[PDB]
Amino acid sequence: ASLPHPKIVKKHTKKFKRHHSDRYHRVAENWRKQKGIDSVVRRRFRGNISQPKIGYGSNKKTKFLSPSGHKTFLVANVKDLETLTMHTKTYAAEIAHNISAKNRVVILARAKALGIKVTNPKGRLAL
Amino acid sequence: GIDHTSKQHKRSGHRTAPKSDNVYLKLLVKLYTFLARRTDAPFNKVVLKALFLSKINRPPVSVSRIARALKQEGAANKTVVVVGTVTDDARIFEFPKTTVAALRFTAGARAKIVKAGGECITLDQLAVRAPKGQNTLILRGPRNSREAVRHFGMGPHKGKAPRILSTGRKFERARGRRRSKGFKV
Amino acid sequence: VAYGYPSYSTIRQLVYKRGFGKINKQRVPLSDNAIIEANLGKYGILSIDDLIHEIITVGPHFKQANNFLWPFKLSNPSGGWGVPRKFKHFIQGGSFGNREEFINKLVKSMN
Amino acid sequence: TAQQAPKWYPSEDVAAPKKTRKAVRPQKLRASLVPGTVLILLAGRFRGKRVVYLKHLEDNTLLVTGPFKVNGVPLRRVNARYVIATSTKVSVEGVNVEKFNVEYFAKEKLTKKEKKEANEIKTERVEDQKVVDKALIAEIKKTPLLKQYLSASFSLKNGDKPHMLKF
Amino acid sequence: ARYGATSTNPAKSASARGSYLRVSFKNTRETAQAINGWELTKAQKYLEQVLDHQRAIPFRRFNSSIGRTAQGKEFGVTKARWPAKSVKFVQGLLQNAAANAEAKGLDATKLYVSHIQVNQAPKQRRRTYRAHGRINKYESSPSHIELVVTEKEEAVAKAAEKKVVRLTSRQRGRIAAQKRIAA
RNA sequence: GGCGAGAGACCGAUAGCGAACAAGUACAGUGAUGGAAAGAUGAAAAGAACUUUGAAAAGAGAGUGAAAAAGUACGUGAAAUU
RNA sequence: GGAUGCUGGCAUAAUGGUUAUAUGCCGCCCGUCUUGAAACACGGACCAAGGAGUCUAACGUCUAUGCGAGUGUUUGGGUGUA
RNA sequence: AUGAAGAGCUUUUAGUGGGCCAUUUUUGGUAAGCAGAACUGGCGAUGCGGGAUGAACCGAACGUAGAGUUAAGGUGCCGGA
RNA sequence: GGGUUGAUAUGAUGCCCUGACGAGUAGGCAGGCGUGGAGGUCAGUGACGAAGCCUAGACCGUAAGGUCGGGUCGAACGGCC
RNA sequence: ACUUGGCGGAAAGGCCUUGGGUGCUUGCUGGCGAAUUGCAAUGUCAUUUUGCGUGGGGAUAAAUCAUUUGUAUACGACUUAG
């Protein structure tokens, strides 16, 4: 249902982890730059972690896209969805996380009727 | 690698697209850059830059200055152009009939010109009358008339106006400023 | 540097393969006598071969043609340099200096 | 709302692709292949088998047969990069091979619903192979041991080195 | 309520608890792991033998610098001990659980002990008086204990999934050719 | 400062007055002086009748409650550590 | 002045990703002052929460805005939905 | 002659104001991985390949990947050849 | 450095073309992510479960970080200028 | 697969031989069959252990604790006895 996109290359699927995020619990994985003076990570020694930089950035034609080829866009209601009405082949819907189950059911039926894709069509379903 | 003979990724050092968020000025800039791009006219390009200019690189222009310019030869029936503001000057008592185009007009200057029988004009009206700068005359005002340019470049044997709040006796008129108290500069 | 007296074949190859014009401070590949006559038509030059003719039968407009030519960005030679260690003279068993007419071999490799 | 909007939505109008300049020219086979020539199948069900080569079809394939009366190979179409061509040469002037073609080698593809639990052949193809194979054996009877050269299979042994071998 | 992790049929099971007990966490842990997975009567008998010092508890984890004893041979060790107090609290719990089990109406000889865990409780803290005018802590490290006993059931089950298979035409043809060529 | 009133682009229980609670309190020091910590069950105690094991505490059941994954070691209940 | 055509199989965890482990090669502990730190130089047992170029008076350059030889309403007064 | 990658001009403000190494010139000193100067290049502020190992040496200066060719160093094996 | 207001359609700070370049401590500038509260808007989510917490489960972004699913819980909270 | 008789002790565990049976023989000439795995997809053929079965034989113990000893000994261990 999507649009012709090129082949998607990401250039780093592995997550950039803060140095010693593994060693000390007080150091969390949220990436954070070693500004030190004798830091082999800042110095880019061999066998150390790769620091982020703008060459790892993605191709503009594939950027923000999901594997489907759609860009995600968050909806809380049929109105936000009707905004996406005419861009189904490029944009897909994410029902928010704070939504109630009955409103989710409504949104899902409406999206089916309008030919719109939904990437979380199982939130708060029993069976 | 490269043995660079320059500095890399350096900016031009020249303002494009001012950081005035005035939408009307931005409209003028859209207009005059279209005109600069197509009308092959140095006047259009000049005006575009002078629109990018800052407040102090956009000084005022006195109607008496305009009058000197029109007292030039071959320049009487011309159309004066000022990217900035036009100020009144009651140090004069006559004034000619010409038309003047500019961004801003002090109410006194506008009155003076209208009374002399001219018309005060905007740059868009100018762009419809004289796109390529037909029969125009650009004026810029003084820049080194400024009470910071007094202090710019302050050193010995330059005569360059120290930075000082209070004036008079016993405020920097002593040692350094006469041969009795040691030395004169 | 390694410098030498070049031949017509290597001039011609260097240009036809690595031929680049400094056109208002950009590096444009040549690909056309139209480009060449647009820029260097002033100097009686129309074709890449007329350019080469000036170059090798050094002319009164060699200055302008050579300056129009972006510097040739050569690769490292294919079969090597012929010597294990480079930074001696060509004479002492190295690479640099005036290798007056083996430069054609080197350049044809690097091209 | 949860997310505001994008200002400009990109269009859906798919751009038509450009007029490519790739023509399709027929295949230039290697000079080691001429019809009536013995091949060695390297791959497939019939891997490692001496077989005959008759025709060069239009989908860059080669028409081939055992013959079936000899080694169990039927009429088939194979690939020149997946066969070795021998030096041995058998005459084939006298076969009506111009009938065969890609439509004759048609599969009638299988659907999706046809999922097999665990697990026919055309009289036309049978009698065709019979015609052709009787002609081929009749020509084979001239040179000696050839029937058996085909009936057997091909293999590499300890000490067999292809770049030093010839076929 | 709200015991630890169990993979067990709660219908064929009984349970027992003890909370905020002034007994050493380490020794109770070792006692527990000594009777873990055991048959219940066997366990009670073993602990009585321990208290008679005819058998022993192995100290697997908290065993540093303690002495050895030949009884560890039974378990593959050298280090073992006889924690009377832990043992007493534990077999009191087992009494509790056997009672609850028979009140549920269980076999009472197919029984075994399928969960037993011990974990640290709030420290009970006194003050010790040390040289040069100093105070230090004298903290009991108490314990919570919970155990769960169970009927042994017959063999669990059989009949795993169908193990669906997806083949190439080539593998199917190989299969069929072999089923042709042979019987 | 005292008494009485109203307000806030202020702090929100390691913050804000030292003190949101029996805080100038407990407590220390000869004394002058010093000077804490500590809020929240639940809408409502309906705060767990009764049975059973145990010397008892408690446990297992039962039951209340919308919820005991709310049981006065009570809102949620992170991490270290287990 | 940038690759198209033909054919086959699969259409699912097969590719791929995440993750653990194994294997090969590399990989000294961070922060710090230091010419020089893996240091036999200092701080760091661990976790959470708090935690450090702010506010003001008067100024310089610069940039925006308003007016423009003038500019500044807001000491004060008038008035008010205060 | 060659090149010019734009030429000129101003304002303002940070950090710095402990320095060290190599080639060559060189002063004191028996000499020093010592002390003190000169030109240039470097380390500091800089990873990469090589030197087993090393702040400075040789080679080469770094966005993310791929393919090819080399530098210096090497090709018994560890270790690619 | 350039091109492009032209009418219908969207974004002129937009779109597009071409060429070159990308080391970095101290330090400077810029563009952004995030937190508490304020004015506005979404006639925003919400006891049919807000926030918070857990999650070698998924998705986006170079990244800061953001979103989603499952679990827990119980009363408020977010997007944008 | 049986069967006769030898040899081999460095880690023999293999080498050789006799008798007869049975099967194949591409030494030679022949006949029948293969197809459809669709133009390739390792296209699956080996040995390593373990377990549950069926059926055929075969055999029906010791050690540790505890106890005791003292030629031993920090406890363990060791030595002895029952």
Q: Which nucleotides of G are covered by protein (CB under 7 A)?
A: 2-12, 17-19, 26-34, 37-38, 46-48, 58-70
Nucleotide nearest to C20 (CA to C1'): I19
Residue type (1 letter), A51: Q
Distance from the Cα of residue E112 to its chain's centroid = 10
For residue D2, list chain A residues with Cβ-Cβ distance below 8 A.
74-76, 80, 96
Distance from the Cα of residue E21 to its chain's centroid = 18
Any chains having at least 3 CB pairs less than 8 A from chain A are D
Of B102, B96, B111, nearest to B64 by C-alpha is B96
E37 dihedral zone (left: phi>0; alpha: psi -120 to 50; beta): left
Q: Assess contact for E86 and E15: CB atoms under 8 A.
A: no
Question: CA(B43)–C1'(F7) in Å?
Answer: 61
Radius of gyration from C-alpha coordinates of chain A: 21
D20 close to A (CB below 8 A): no
Chain-chain contact of D12 with A74 (C-beta, under 8 angstroms): no
CA–CA gap between residue E59 and residue E32 (Å, rounded): 11
Show the beta-strand stretches assigned E in chain C.
Answer: 2-3, 20-23, 26-29, 97-98
Long-range contacts of D95-102 (CB under 8 A, 24+ apart): D95/D54, D95/D132, D95/D135, D95/D136, D96/D131, D96/D132, D97/D54, D97/D55, D97/D63, D97/D132, D99/D128, D100/D55, D100/D57, D100/D63, D100/D75, D100/D128, D101/D57, D101/D58, D102/D57, D102/D58, D102/D59, D102/D61, D102/D77
* H or E stretch covering E136: strand E134-140
* H or E stretch covering E60: none
Say how many C-beta atoms besides its own lie within 10 A of residue C46's C-beta: 15
The burial of E13, by beta-carbon neighbours within 10 Å (0-12 exposed, 13-18 middle, 19 or more buried), is given as buried
For residue E176, list chain D residues with Cβ-Cβ distance below 8 A.
119
Beta-bridge mates of residue E127: E137
Residue type (1 letter), D80: A
A90 close to D (CB below 8 A): yes
CA–CA gap between residue C18 and residue C27 (Å, rounded): 11
Q: Which nucleotides of J are covered by protein (CB under 7 A)?
A: 26, 32-41, 43-44, 64-66, 74-77
For residue D9, list chain A residues with Cβ-Cβ distance below 8 A.
86-87, 90-91
Say how many C-beta atoms besides its own lie within 10 A of residue B35's C-beta: 20
For residue E172, list chain D residues with Cβ-Cβ distance below 8 A.
116, 118-119
**Rounded (10°) CA dihedral B177, B179, B180, B183:** 70
Residue type (1 letter), B137: L
Can you give the resolution of this entry in Å? 3.1
- Which residues, in sequence order, are CB contacts of A69 under 8 Å at separation 6+? A2, A3, A5
**Which token pair is A118?**
């939904």
Say how many C-beta atoms besides its own lie within 10 A of residue E175's C-beta: 14
Q: Assess contact for E55 and E106: CB atoms under 8 A.
A: no
**Could you list the protein residues whose CB lies below 7 A from any atom in strand H?**
A 11-12, 37, 43-46, 50, 53-57; B 1-2, 5-6, 10, 12-14, 151-153; C 22, 25, 62-63, 66-67, 75-81, 83-87
- Which residues, in sequence order, are CB contacts of D12 under 8 Å at separation 6+? A3, A87, A89, A90
Q: Assess contact for E61 and E161: CB atoms under 8 A.
A: no
Q: In angstroms, what separates the C-alpha of E181 from chain D's closest C-alpha?
A: 14
Q: In angstroms, what separates the C-alpha of D12 from chain A's closest C-alpha?
A: 7
Radius of gyration from C-alpha coordinates of chain D: 24
Of E180, E170, E168, E183, nearest to D120 by C-alpha is E180
CA–CA gap between residue D71 and residue D45 (Å, rounded): 13
CA–CA gap between residue E183 and residue E179 (Å, rounded): 6
CA–CA gap between residue B31 and residue B39 (Å, rounded): 12
Distance from the Cα of residue B26 to its chain's centroid = 19
CA–CA gap between residue D53 and residue C59 (Å, rounded): 65
D3 close to A (CB below 8 A): yes
φ, ψ dihedrals at E63, nearest 5°: -140, 15
Q: Which nucleotides of H are covered by protein (CB under 7 A)?
A: 1-12, 45-49, 58-65, 68-74
**Could you list the protein residues whose CB lies below 7 A from any atom in strand F?**
A 25; E 1-2, 14-21, 92, 95-96, 99-100, 103, 119-120, 122
**CA-to-CA dists, residue C41 to C27, C34, C46, C54, C65, angstroms:** 18, 9, 6, 13, 11
Q: Considering only residues 29 to 48 of chain A, which have any Cβ-Cβ distance to chain D shorter than 8 Å?
A: none
CA–CA gap between residue B107 and residue B87 (Å, rounded): 8
Long-range contacts of B109-117 (CB under 8 A, 24+ apart): B109/B63, B110/B86, B112/B63, B112/B88, B113/B63
**CA-to-CA dists, residue B87 to B94, B146, B162, C97, angstroms:** 15, 17, 30, 71
Say how many C-beta atoms besides its own lie within 10 A of residue D75's C-beta: 21
D8 close to A (CB below 8 A): no
Q: Assess contact for A77 and A103: CB atoms under 8 A.
A: yes
Residue type (1 letter), D43: A
E172 close to D (CB below 8 A): yes
